[PDB]
Amino acid sequence: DYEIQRERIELGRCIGEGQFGDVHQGIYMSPPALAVAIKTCKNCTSDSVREKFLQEALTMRQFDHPHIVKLIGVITENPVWIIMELCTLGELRSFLQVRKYSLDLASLILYAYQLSTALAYLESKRFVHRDIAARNVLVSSNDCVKLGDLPIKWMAPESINFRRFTSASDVWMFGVCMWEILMHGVKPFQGVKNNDVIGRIENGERLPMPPNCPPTLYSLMTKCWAYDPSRRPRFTELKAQLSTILEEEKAQ
Ligand SMILES: O=C1CN2C(=NN1)COc1ccccc12
Numbered sequence: 001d002y003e004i005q006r007e008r009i010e011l012g013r014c015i016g017e018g019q020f021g022d023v024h025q026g027i028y029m030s031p032p033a034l035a036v037a038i039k040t041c042k043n044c045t046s047d048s049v050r051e052k053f054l055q056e057a058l059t060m061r062q063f064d065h066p067h068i069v070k071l072i073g074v075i076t077e078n079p080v081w082i083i084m085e086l087c088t089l090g091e092l093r094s095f096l097q098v099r100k101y102s103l104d105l106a107s108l109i110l111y112a113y114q115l116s117t118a119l120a121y122l123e124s125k126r127f128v129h130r131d132i133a134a135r136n137v138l139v140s141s142n143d144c145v146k147l148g149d150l151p152i153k154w155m156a157p158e159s160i161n162f163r164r165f166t167s168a169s170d171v172w173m174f175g176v177c178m179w180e181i182l183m184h185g186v187k188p189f190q191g192v193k194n195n196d197v198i199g200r201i202e203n204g205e206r207l208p209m210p211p212n213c214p215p216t217l218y219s220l221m222t223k224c225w226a227y228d229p230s231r232r233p234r235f236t237e238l239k240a241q242l243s244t245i246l247e248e249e250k251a252q
Pocket of ligand 1: 023
């Protein structure tokens with residue numbers, strides 16, 4: 001039973017925004033004082049919105065991975081809330097930007113490694129994500145990131161051209177996500193028009209090597225960006241390669 005008694009929740013300060021409403025941090029008193037994230041729903045007094053909001057919680061129930069945010073429970077009567085595991089440090093993009101000059105390379109590589117483990121897990125569950133980007137990643141601690149919950153600049157050419165979405169197109173998007181982390185949260189193709197992104201990629205052009213990114217890690221990003229989806233590594237191969245790049249970086 002995922003239904004939580006409202007009196008067990010102390011609503012704290014607003015910490016961010018979601019599609020349905022504000023996200024707040026708070027406290028969950030269970031049989032004691034667990035820090036939680038509380039997702040609110042502005043229009044949940046309407047059942048069409050309520051069903052869509054609560055469907056997200058039902059989706060979360062299916063996953064059990066250390067690098068995917070966990071659902072704690074729901075409050076189905078107005079105001080409708082979803083109680084999630086709190087990732088205290090917030091959104092990854094903002095975290096990377098604020099810590100641009102204070103996060104070492106080993107930490108950046110660790111975040112890419114952890115995200116590849118969560119994605120190889122979702123691949124093993126036969127779940128295609130379709131929206132892999134640094135914006136949907138949350139920070140639990142300085143050493144732990146988690147997956148939370150058209151973007152032409154992040155999309156595989158087959159997804160843009162023919163709406164083909166597979167684990168291989170998720171790999172392309174993850175290559176862009178790895179570039180974003182190594183770029184300290186800078187978005188890809190800044191100042192480039194969406195309709196001119198496909199052309200540049202068709203021309204063989206790719207996102208450049210981020211400053212201070214190891215060549216072995218940049219090489220792994222470019223394999224994610226092979227035009228042919230069958231030539232892209234699988235998430236399991238990404239995981240094994242990122243583990244070796246992480247160890248090499250941890251050794252100096
Ligand atoms: O499910 C969640 C959603 N979330 C948090 N934790 N857990 C904390 O950082 C956030 C920042 C912005 C939006 C959502 C969150």
